[PDB]
């Protein structure tokens, strides 16, 4: 599938109640403090083109932490 709804803003469907900058899957609030806030040293580890719309996923930490944080999320410099 293409797109129809986010709300993750980016893996790409599930959603839900409006945190920081985005509109994130609460799985992706979730995934974003727990690489960002305690649990990431990481340049992609699949690959950085480990794909979310939804065809996909082919999932990982920094490609769609980043693909994630171009909607500015913030688990931020989180929290560093
Ligand atoms: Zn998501
Ligand atoms: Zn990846």
Avoid at 9 to 17: I, N, R
């Amino acid at each position: 599938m293409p797109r129809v709804y986010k709300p993750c803003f980016v893996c790409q469907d599930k959603s839900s109640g409006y945190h920081y900058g985005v509109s994130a899957c609460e799985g992706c609030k979730g995934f974003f403090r727990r690489s960002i806030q305690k649990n990431m040293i990481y340049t992609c580890h699949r690959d950085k083109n480990c794909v979310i719309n939804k065809v996909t996923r082919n999932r990982c930490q920094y490609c769609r932490l980043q693909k994630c944080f171009e909607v500015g999320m913030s688990k931020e410099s989180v929290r560093n």
